[PDB]
């Protein structure tokens, strides 16, 4: 009655759903009016609606995500550990202190996107654009350059 109340949310449309999320407060979380219905999703799922606002920073560790256009979105200090973000648009996004650990995010689009505080453990970035490296330390920089990322 739980796992349902998930897989019914990611059955909607998207209007529908942020609907949902508005007579929910997870209004915040418009991203979530965008991710696809399958495994992953309805598991990352089931952890903001138990709790909801309870967490209130964005945890979508191990979420499908590929191909998305999440553009200018925020992710203050959210977990994206293990999570699948290839071919996605994060174009001009914060992700100031956002945990990219073990994440996929070959071919994504990350120009323009503040990233002070980020971690890139064991992160797969082949062909990731990074633009500037906003928030980067010239380390950070030098070690993602080496691993695939592209710059300016």
Same mark, same amino acid.
């Given at each position: ?20 999320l508005?007579?929910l407060g997870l &209004?915040?979380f418009? *991203? ?15 952890? *903001? @609606? ?23 979105? /925020?992710?203050?200090? &959210? ?7 290839? &071919? /996605? /648009? ?6 100031? @202190?956002?945990? *990219? ?33 906003? &928030? ?17």
């Amino acid at each position: 009655d739980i796992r349902s109340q998930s897989i019914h949310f990611l059955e909607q449309s998207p209007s529908e759903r942020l609907q949902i999320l508005q007579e929910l407060g997870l &209004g915040r979380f418009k *991203f979530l009016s965008k991710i696809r219905l399958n495994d992953s999703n309805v598991d990352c799922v089931i952890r *903001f @609606f138990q709790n909801p606002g309870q967490m209130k920073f964005p945890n979508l560790s191990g979420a499908d995500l590929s191909e998305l256009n999440l553009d200018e979105v /925020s992710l203050i200090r &959210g977990n994206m550990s293990e999570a699948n973000l290839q &071919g /996605s /648009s994060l174009l001009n996004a914060d992700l100031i @202190f956002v945990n *990219f650990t073990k994440a996929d995010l070959r071919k994504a689009d990350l120009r323009g996107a503040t990233m002070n505080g980020t971690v890139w453990l064991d992160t797969l970035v082949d062909e990731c654009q990074l633009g500037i490296g906003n &928030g980067l330390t010239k380390q950070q920089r030098k070690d993602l350059q080496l691993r695939g990322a592209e710059f300016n």
